[PDB]
From a paper:
The CsiD protein belongs to the non-haem Fe(II)-dependent oxygenase family (protein family PF08943), but the native substrate(s) of the predicted enzyme and its role during stationary phase of E. coli remained unknown. We purified CsiD and demonstrated by NMR and LC-MS that it indeed hydroxylates GA to 2-hydroxyglutarate, while the co-substrate αKG is converted to succinate (SA) (and CO2), as is common for this enzyme class. The biological tetrameric form of CsiD is generated by the symmetry of the crystallographic lattice, as it was previously the case in structures lacking the by then unknown substrate. The enzyme protomer adopts a distorted jelly-roll fold composed of a β-sheet core flanked by α-helices, as previously described.
In order to shed more light on this interesting finding, we solved the atomic structure of CsiD in complex with its substrate (GA), its product (SA) as well as in complex with the αKG-analog N-oxalylglycine (NOG) as inhibitor, by X-ray crystallography. Ligand-bound CsiD structures revealed two binding sites located at opposite sides of the Fe2+ ion. The co-substrate site (here termed site II) is seen in crystal structures in this work occupied by (a) the non-processable αKG-analogue NOG (where atom C3 is substituted by nitrogen compared to αKG) or (b) the co-product SA. SA is bound to Fe2+ via a terminal carboxyl group in a bidentate fashion and further interacts with Arg309 through a low-occupancy solvent molecule that occupies the site that is generated by decarboxylation of αKG to SA, mimicking the interaction to the NOG oxygen in that complex. Importantly, in structures with site I or II occupied, always the cognate ligand for the respective site was observed with the other site unoccupied. Conformational changes in the CsiD protein were not observed in any of the complexed structures, independently of whether ligand site I or site II was occupied.
Author numbering:
A (entry chain A), B (entry chain A), C (entry chain A), D (entry chain A): 16 to 142, 149 to 218, 223 to 324
Amino acid sequence: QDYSGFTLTPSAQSPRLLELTFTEQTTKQFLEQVAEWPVQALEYKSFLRFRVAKILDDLCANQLQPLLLKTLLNRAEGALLINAVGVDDVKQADEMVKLATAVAHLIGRSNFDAMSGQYYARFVVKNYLRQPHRVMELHNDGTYVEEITDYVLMMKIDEQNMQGGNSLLLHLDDWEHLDNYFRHPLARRPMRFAAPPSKDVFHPVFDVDQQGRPVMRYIDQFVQPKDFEEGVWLSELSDAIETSKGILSVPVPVGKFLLINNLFWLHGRDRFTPHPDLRRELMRQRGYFAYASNHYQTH
Amino acid sequence: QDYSGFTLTPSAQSPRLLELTFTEQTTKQFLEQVAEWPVQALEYKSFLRFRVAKILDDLCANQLQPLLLKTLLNRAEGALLINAVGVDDVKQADEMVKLATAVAHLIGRSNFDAMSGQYYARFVVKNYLRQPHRVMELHNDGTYVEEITDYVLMMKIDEQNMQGGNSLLLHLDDWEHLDNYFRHPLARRPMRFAAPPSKDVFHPVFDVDQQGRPVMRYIDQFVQPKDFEEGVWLSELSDAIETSKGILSVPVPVGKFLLINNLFWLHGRDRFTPHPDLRRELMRQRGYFAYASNHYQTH
Amino acid sequence: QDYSGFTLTPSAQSPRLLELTFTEQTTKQFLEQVAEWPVQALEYKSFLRFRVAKILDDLCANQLQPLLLKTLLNRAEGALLINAVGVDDVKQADEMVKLATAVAHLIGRSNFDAMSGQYYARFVVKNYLRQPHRVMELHNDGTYVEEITDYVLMMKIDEQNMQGGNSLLLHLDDWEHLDNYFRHPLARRPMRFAAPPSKDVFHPVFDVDQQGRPVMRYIDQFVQPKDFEEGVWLSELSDAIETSKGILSVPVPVGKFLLINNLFWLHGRDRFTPHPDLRRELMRQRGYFAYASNHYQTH
Amino acid sequence: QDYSGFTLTPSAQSPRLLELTFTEQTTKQFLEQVAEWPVQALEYKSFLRFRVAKILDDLCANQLQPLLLKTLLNRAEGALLINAVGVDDVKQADEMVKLATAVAHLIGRSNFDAMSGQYYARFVVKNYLRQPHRVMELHNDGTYVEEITDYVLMMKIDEQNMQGGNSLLLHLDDWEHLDNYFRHPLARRPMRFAAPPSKDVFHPVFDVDQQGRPVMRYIDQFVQPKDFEEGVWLSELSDAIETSKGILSVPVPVGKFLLINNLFWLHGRDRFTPHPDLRRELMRQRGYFAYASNHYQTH
Ligand SMILES: [Fe+2]
Ligand SMILES: [Fe+2]
Ligand SMILES: [Fe+2]
Ligand SMILES: [Fe+2]
């Protein structure tokens, strides 16, 4: 299991989460070969996101794309942590954005992001939610729209005078309370979802895949229980997730990013220590799967 | 008729309006048990409104919820005034918001409020409508949307150098002119309703419940008569309400709130005395009923 | 033809345009009887527009409403100029608004006005369109919405150091070129209409009434010809209207207003002389007809 | 091939692009005959755009309109460059706008332009896209709306301390790679298109005319490939256009404008030299064809 242009190894936290590192040579060739397109050009022309994607897959002998797809579609795995040797300082923020864009567009397409107005977003924490000193709860993304979100991506840009603040993760077949909530009649009841500042949507909190196994579509801030029966059941569901013993805690140094299957993984973030001269900065992307396979058709 | 955790007694104004007071011990236990969620957290996660609701009902031995439901659904009653010993100064505004949220979410759910952007709203009067020195006319809430609003809630936050300004109320089976307006062909004619700064709606001013008795959906500022036949009839309807001898006048001290069935009760507010150093502050919520019962179903 | 509370006489400009004047006594009784509702209250509660309407019709022994209706629906007439003795200075602007509101709501209802945000609008000219020194072209109102506008109302509020600026009017059975444009196949072709800052509408420039006679729906600023065939025909139509010999020129002193049938009359405004200390001010309303009559119905 | 009021000659760049020049006499008569309508009046009343169009065609003995139509609808030609003797300085900007409006409205109608809020737009470059020092890529206009855009118009207003910056053009039957991309199954696959700051649209990148020949609807900034199959194919399509040997390079002096068939021509712009005192200014319009012809009809 040795690949062309990168190395792949299980993480220190779980065998379901794989670490993928691009070599110093692959890194410096990719940055040379995309130096003519600044970050502003990727924002303007979306076919260029698939072009820098092909450039990176070609530099890895067309082994990157089927590997990313097999890993993200395998019920037993479904998640990755990614970096490139030599890209690791806040003064290299532009190079970091280019690298994350190429990986996403081998597996599908990244959707528009309302908070930045682009296909990605950057934000700073001092002294999503930028509230220091508290934990961010585990959730799926994309629950408040009709089309399914298949994947989520998150990258670290700067860090100064900083203690704490790791990322958190949870897989459904590691969640000890799945069968109890899935066999409840409310697991198959469609419910309402809504975000703060368009239209509301209706779907169950659980569904099944093609073989009959469970998948989830949940976040505490945006689900809207219609009555006391739904609302109590959901607050019990929230506690059963946040106190799960299956949660992973992952540091993300300046230069690295996570990428996960959004149907059977959830994610979040830990609290940190205050300091008068503290600084932290992040970047994110989200989207759907699209790929080739052999199946029936007519005419 | 002695209950666990609270006392219940008819008001000095009418036997249709009941006063419900939480003991100093229930109050201090509820504030301790919800101290980890500040008001900002209830704004962010709506299942937490049903959680603080369950916490309060459990502290009353599951006697609060069937009592609130029986009272609000009984055609003969339908209204309540509520407070908690020890919570009574403008410096305790945050504690007041928490208490009102728990009561509402035992009977149904509170709807989004466009003037504050949250599920509740706070406003100040000096020197809805903040016009001093004039009366606010009796009405139902929610007339300018399609779904029915089943209940209304209103709470007092501060008061300084203040004379006057009580709340006003009216029940349909106490209104001496009901039969005259209900048997008119215009009582069953659908009419247009519209608010100031979306879409208009069409419904009659009167309807019936399941037994055939009358209910109302009326406010003077937002109904829009289409011709001289409808417009004269409505201005006669307005005078017949504002001069009714069945109206109740209720002071609401710092710390107390009203909660009423919006289908067969109407509500309003009295005028007050000017003073250079005067100050008054309020809070409100509105929503629909949802509960369990035995009835037919298929498949 | 002597009426209770007012006098009625043909104008100096045409027998199709009648002048209606309320006596000093009717004026001072109406202003007393509506003094408890300031202009701000008519803005807030629309049934009060039909109430001040009934108050004025009652002061005229229920002769005003059938007279206004017979006049506006008669193909041979269709227009009025209205005033009240003693109301004639810029310091009485509020009294003027009250009078015009009562007349309109005996015949139908005035529609929302987007430029002021109320059911009426006021504007000032110095040194619709506030361009001094040029003529405003003849048109119908309401061409860019789906529902028909049956009437138009316009009132004068102030005037200082001012020469020129009369109102202009034209009736279709006085227009020498009607038959030529009505028998053209393009008279019955639906066309597109659009305003500057929602949705566009499609209707012919001409139609017929129930007997088969012609009516119009035209304005130069908002009709949008789709091709050279429609566009040339419309610019010829515009010249044939602006140079018509049937146009009337009407001064409107501080305190008076016009009110006309919008289906077979058009209206506009003349140019004026500049002066460093010049000032002029106006008010308008628009709406549809609604009234009782004997006709067939089922069930 | 000598015409009344203007001269017509093939350009120095291609026989598919014809140059049309109005004489000094036609120019000074047109400016006199439209001097009563300033640019502000053409903005307000759209039938006046067809009026100044008829005025110009009449000054050319009704030979301009069938010539413009025959040229733009002929698959072998389809493009023009236009000017008027004596109109050539930034102080004559208003006269330039009037001339371009008259030509467009003989062949069809110019659509609303969102960046200026009028039927045309003006913009300045210093030191669409105003980025100095880089090339603007070849494209069709109107790809992100449902109705077809048949033509495009572009005019030069000022130029100071300026080196470089010509216009660029490409005809499909001059494009060496047409057959290769047209016979691909993706040429007939409907795809999604979207602009930055309403609704998205779906159409193939290629279609056919009534005889079965190819036409195009493409721009790199607004097409949105749905997967890696579409996205790679489009980035190959972009390179095959930008490096085509069939591209024309056209200077456009102060006072001249281009006008082209948008179904089988594409267009763009070259880079230029920096200078502390540099200045350049432009104007544009776009729309659809509408004209008379002999064909079948019913009833
Ligand atoms: Fe997230
Ligand atoms: Fe209310
Ligand atoms: Fe008008
Ligand atoms: Fe363009």
